[PDB]
Structures are given as structure tokens and as C-alpha cells.
Amino acid sequence: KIHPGVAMTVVRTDEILSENILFSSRASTSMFIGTPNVSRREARVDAVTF
């Protein structure tokens, strides 16, 4: 327990799982939502996948 001639300043990161709050004012963005396309992918005899 002899103190050396230097001084150490120990640095560490700390990962913290926080819980944010999101505000967004009335009519902030504007969405142009279109009618979706449907495409029959799996032409199976057991079950069809659209």
C-alpha cells in the first residue's frame, strides 16, 4: 500500500436500459397510405400463402 508517483483516473462506460418518452404534436407528419397489393406466393395443395 505504497502510493506510486502517478495518479490514475479510472474511466468506465455504464450501459443503462432507459425508458424514453416520445412527444409528437398534432398533425406533425402526413401519411399517404395506399391500398395494399396482394400476391399469391405459395401455390401449395396444402395451404395457400398470400
In this structure, the dihedral spanned by the alpha carbons of residues 43, 47, 48 and 50, taken in order and rounded to 10 degrees, is: -130
Residue from 18, 25, 39, 49 that binds its own copies (CB under 8 A)? 39
- Candidate list 12, 26, 40, 49; residue touching its own copies; CB under 8 A: 40
CA torsion sign for 21, 27, 28, 29 is: positive
Q: Is 26 in the site for its own copies (CB under 8 A)?
A: no
Whichever of 3 and 40 has its CB closer to its own copies, that residue is: 40
Residue 45 makes contact with its own copies by CB under 8 A: yes
